Design a protein around this ligand. Structure first.
Ligand SMILES: CCO/N=C/c1ccc(OCCCCCN2CCN(c3ccncc3)C2=O)cc1
Ligand SMILES: CCO/N=C/c1ccc(OCCCCCN2CCN(c3ccncc3)C2=O)cc1
Lengths: 97, 245, 297, 48, 245, 297, 49
């Protein structure tokens, strides 16, 4: 496992480290959206930060399952439940939870 | 080792790190209808993984003044996913359910929800207050769909019966200082082997705060309660065109 | 024939419901074992977790030092048949002379026992019930007098023609069962089998009997299940001329060979109607007596 | 896609915002084929 | 004894008293995907009787001047019954088909229809007549749905290929003086074990009159051609929300 | 575990496709058996029912009196490898000096063999094909002259950077396979494996490559299947200065180890474009020669 | 935090079917990846330079 830059938006030098992590915070319970990204490993985007994505660039075809492990770095007193979903081909970006 | 758990069925997996075991209603697991209990002669369709999976249908906000809510089964799912389609295209239906109610807070919040399953949960009205009017609950109140419905008089469960005795039914409690979820497995309950998923609700799910939510000014005030459920051993028969009611 | 592995190792079709519990013989109350003092770490019977949903498993023996008690108190009077096989009033029929209701010398009673609170509250402790029954008919005048009058009772199942008068052709009773008895004879009495199309009657039906839109004018049928509607009980004075006396027929039901499933909370508000659990909203009363303070008797 | 199932709850005294770090890799059924050059060439002019 | 037949599958039965045997395309029956041919890892759903049954989708009127029509599979069924729902909710799909084309007349009518199945039936355009315009067929022409589509130039099958050689594909003829139906069983045909029921049409069904319909003034002039078909061994995988295209 | 009978006796999951036919060895044409006259009722070989969909099963022996003929004519030249393993032109690349197209000394050829009719018509007889291939590259000037010039051919698979000039960094070719050869050397030649992500290439794909609305502007992608797009073949004169001569590279393909499925009607109208079966609507011609009358030669 | 990668597999996260995977791992060996000739040096021998 290598760090996936889900938060691939900041681009100025002093903010580059912010791409390595994304936030969660107290909401208003409307099952709000936290983040999204394509699962395509050999495509431009977040996966480019991973060693998998890079090695993947030296091959034309790939096959197999992938895995993303999310580590929560909030305080010990913080709790919560998140729903992480994978939408197979054909399904557009889910409008809601 | 009893507080930690994983529920995997179909293409869905649930995890919890603060569970309080699992209740198997009336002590028995869901099963398919036997050849001697059955009566309808057509070969049933048993879709398996496409319908027996976890569906997260609704989220309610728990407040210091909340009264409690209820949902009806299989009503909550009749319009969702492949399960719903099967319930609409078929006259006959039967299945069990795995219910997982979620609610987490902090070690500084407090409160307790009673989560129970009540078969044949018939709703009554207040009879015009004086009890002289023979009113009846409207369709939207007897089969509230996925949004569920809020109890008007929780003490009598809107049906003239004491909530104090609701624990005689399969249940669990979500006591914030202890656990953050309730898991109840329910087998098919009816006096018939199969029935209409549209006309008849086999049971109701009740989530009622008995010990009110409380916390000090400054702690996260939005405490959601989410309902996730999975049909088990779903069977359908009597195929024709789709019907919503 | 099958071949792909997931089909072979499938559990789709398992009809044997796995049960986590089983019944044990229990003709008497449990005995008490001698117990002594326990001063342990790790062992903690008194501590529970009600959240789990189970009742406490702590016993007398582990909470205090107990003696041995050989308990031979019987558990026989709390079986379903013991509790239910006692005849109670479930219906009443009036056959007045000059009256508002039945001034024609005959009457049709819809077979529904929910019009009387004592009996109703007892059966409503369960959701589903299957049983046979013994019905007894006590007839007399409004003053409790016995007069030399002959009556005919007829059971009219759903679909059979209901008599519309004391002289209806339906009283020919060529197929329906009828009972002819005098008011002076002892109460008529018969055995009735379990007649529902379902495996059990159900005191609660959360649903509608038919498909379609469930608009305002049809909401009277919410909770109505035909599997509970066994028919009509008709009675008439046997004659072509009006009877000389006003009569009352009390109907008693005694269940026998009872089976019940799914217990539920017991009714704690007065009953208002037969067909539903409606309660008076302005008179919601606590389940029991109350006191002025939690720290005083 | 990642959604809030319930909510991020915290008591008085703890930050209202925290971060999640995502780590990714392939499963054991993963393989690749048809060796090709990467889309990037990390050099502008000649490397001296 | 070869002219008479009964096809029963699911809750549907077809009868015919003037058949001409049954063709099993490329000599092989539909079958489920084996564990070694498969590649996707999720357990598939195999609905069985609720989707593998006969669906009667369309009726065309055969006329003295008719040119012929075609339908695409599984396109014709993507919006019908439980089959359609499964095709919409799942990314992956595979199945075989039993096609039964019906057309009866009288012993005084005449004509012959060629009924064939052509895998990967790619449609072409007339290139602006002169062949200098690189036009392309519109969605409604490549995937006509249940109504099918009428051929513009049957001689070249609207694709630059001779219909005279179409018999190299699984086929039957409906020669009015002989039979009143055609029955063709087709196994799953593709270079992949599963595929999208929406994006890819595995084959096209062609019904083309080669010997024109004829009869004398006074005989019933309305001669319908009805299309009935049944999926066989349907399998679906890759579940998510329903998508129509 | 299973229990209800319909599940046990189910055929759901059978992965073995039952085949009604099987291959037999046939190295030579079939022999002819002696036959004599048959004057029977009941036996009727000559009569068929084409409606069934099968071809006639009548043989020489039953239609006329035949002699015995021992046929040893080979069937070897009609195997797929015999028919297809003959190199034919499938691509042509121009590298002119002062020109309209490639005046930069390099060129990118999209690997698609459908630009030449002879080869295309042959492969399009089948729907699916799986094969390895031998590619040969013949280079010379437009007059057929051979000059002392060095070239570089590079295979650029989908996703690899395509050179955009004679001096592109991509020619470093650290992973892509490249061939360096002189025009004076014999034609370069290499073996190429079966590279599709699918089990076979397909000359026809009745569908779209992606989901979504298939509006007018996207109809150019109808019939486009990425499983057939193997990449780009790039060529350049090896140098930093423009070459002194104009070059032409002809690409020949020879399939080998061929397998094919689903035969189809053979093209009978001229080809217009590579990507589709479009034909000129105003010039639809009969498949063959015609005559003035059906009763005359 | 431990430093190891996740040991969770497809089988335990969703209901899977059986798949006999015969996809080769041969092209990702070091020799397969590196034994392809690439440009590493260039030398100029000009006339008047
Ligand atoms: C010669 C005539 O003698 N026959 C007498 C007779 C007496 C009783 C009888 O049937 C009695 C059936 C009692 C069933 C009562 N139940 C079944 C469930 N149920 C019910 C009522 C209201 N809501 C739900 C269920 C009922 O009221 C038939 C004939
Ligand atoms: C040092 C470089 O040497 N490499 C030469 C080379 C030659 C050929 C090559 O790949 C040739 C693959 C031929 C596949 C042709 N196909 C496959 C199916 N297809 C097709 C075209 C249009 N519509 C559908 C399918 C095709 O055009 C790769 C490298």
């Amino acid at each position: 496992e290598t760090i996936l830059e889900v938060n691939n938006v900041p681009t100025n030098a002093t903010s580059l480290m912010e791409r390595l992590r994304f936030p969660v915070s107290a909401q208003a319970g409307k099952g709000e959206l936290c983040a999204v990204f394509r699962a395509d490993p050999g495509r431009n985007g977040p996966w480019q930060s991973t060693l998998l994505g890079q090695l993947c660039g030296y091959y034309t075809q790939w096959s197999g399952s992938l895995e993303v492990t999310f580590m929560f770095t909030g305080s010990f007193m913080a709790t919560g439940k998140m729903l992480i979903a994978y939408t197979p081909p054909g399904g557009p970006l889910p409008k809601d939870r | 080792s009893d507080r930690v758990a994983q529920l995997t069925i179909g293409n869905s997996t649930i995890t919890t790190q603060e569970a309080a075991n699992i209740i198997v209603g009336y002590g028995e697991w869901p099963s398919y209808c036997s050849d001697s209990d059955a009566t309808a002669v057509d070969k049933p369709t048993r879709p398996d993984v496409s319908v027996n999976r976890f569906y997260t249908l609704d989220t309610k906000l728990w407040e210091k003044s909340s009264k409690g809510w209820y949902w009806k089964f299989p009503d909550v799912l009749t319009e969702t996913g492949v399960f719903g389609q099967n319930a609409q295209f078929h006259y006959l239906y039967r299945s069990g359910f795995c219910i997982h109610v979620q609610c987490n807070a902090s070690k500084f919040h407090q409160g307790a929800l009673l989560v129970a399953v009540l078969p044949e949960y018939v709703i009554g009205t207040v009879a015009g207050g004086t009890g002289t009017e023979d009113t009846h609950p409207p369709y939207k109140q007897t089969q509230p769909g996925a949004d569920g419905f809020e109890l008007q008089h929780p003490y009598v469960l809107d049906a003239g019966i004491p909530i104090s005795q609701l624990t005689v039914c399969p249940h669990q409690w979500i006591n914030l200082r202890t656990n953050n979820c309730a898991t109840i497995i329910v087998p098919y309950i009816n006096a018939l082997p199969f029935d209409s998923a549209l006309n008849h609700c086999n049971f109701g799910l009740l989530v009622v705060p008995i010990s009110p939510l409380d916390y000090d000014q400054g702690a996260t005030p939005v405490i959601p309660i989410t309902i996730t459920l999975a049909p088990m051993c779903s069977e359908f028969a009597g195929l024709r065109q789709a019907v919503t009611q | 024939g099958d071949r792909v592995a997931d089909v072979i190792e499938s559990s789709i079709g398992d009809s044997v419901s796995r049960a986590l519990t089983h019944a044990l013989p229990a003709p008497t109350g449990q005995n008490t074992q001698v117990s002594s003092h326990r001063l342990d770490t790790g062992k903690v019977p008194a501590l529970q977790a009600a959240e789990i949903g189970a009742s406490s498993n702590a016993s007398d023996e582990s909470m205090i030092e107990t003696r041995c008690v050989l308990n031979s108190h019987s558990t026989a009077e709390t079986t379903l048949d013991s509790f239910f096989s006692r005849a109670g009033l479930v219906g009443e029929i009036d056959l007045p002379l000059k009256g508002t209701t039945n001034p024609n010398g005959y009457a049709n009673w819809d077979i529904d026992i929910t019009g009387y609170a004592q009996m109703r509250r007892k059966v409503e402790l369960f959701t589903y019930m299957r049983f046979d029954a013994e019905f007894t008919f006590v007839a007399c005048t409004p003053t409790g007098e016995v007069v030399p009058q002959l009556l005919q009772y007829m059971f009219v199942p759903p679909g059979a023609p209901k008599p519309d008068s004391r002289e209806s052709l339906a009283w020919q009773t060529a197929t329906n069962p009828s009972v002819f008895v005098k008011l002076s004879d002892p109460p008529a009495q018969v055995s009735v089998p379990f007649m529902s199309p379902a495996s059990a009657y159900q005191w609660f039906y959360d649903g509608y009997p038919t498909f379609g839109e469930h608009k305002q004018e049809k909401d009277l049928e919410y909770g109505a299940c035909p599997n509970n509607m066994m028919g009509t009980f008709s009675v008439r004075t046997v004659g072509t001329s009006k009877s000389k006396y006003p009569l009352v027929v009390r109907i008693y039901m005694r269940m026998k060979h009872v089976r019940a499933w799914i217990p539920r909370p017991m009714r704690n508000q007065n009953y208002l109607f037969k067909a539903n659990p409606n309660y008076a909203g302005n008179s919601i009363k606590p389940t029991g007596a109350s006191r002025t303070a939690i720290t005083t008797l | 896609s990642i959604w809030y199932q319930t909510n991020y709850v915290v008591p008085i005294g703890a930050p209202n915002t925290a971060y999640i770090i995502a780590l990714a890799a392939a499963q054991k059924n993963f393989t690749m084929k048809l060796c090709k050059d990467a889309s990037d060439i990390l050099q502008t002019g000649t490397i001296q």
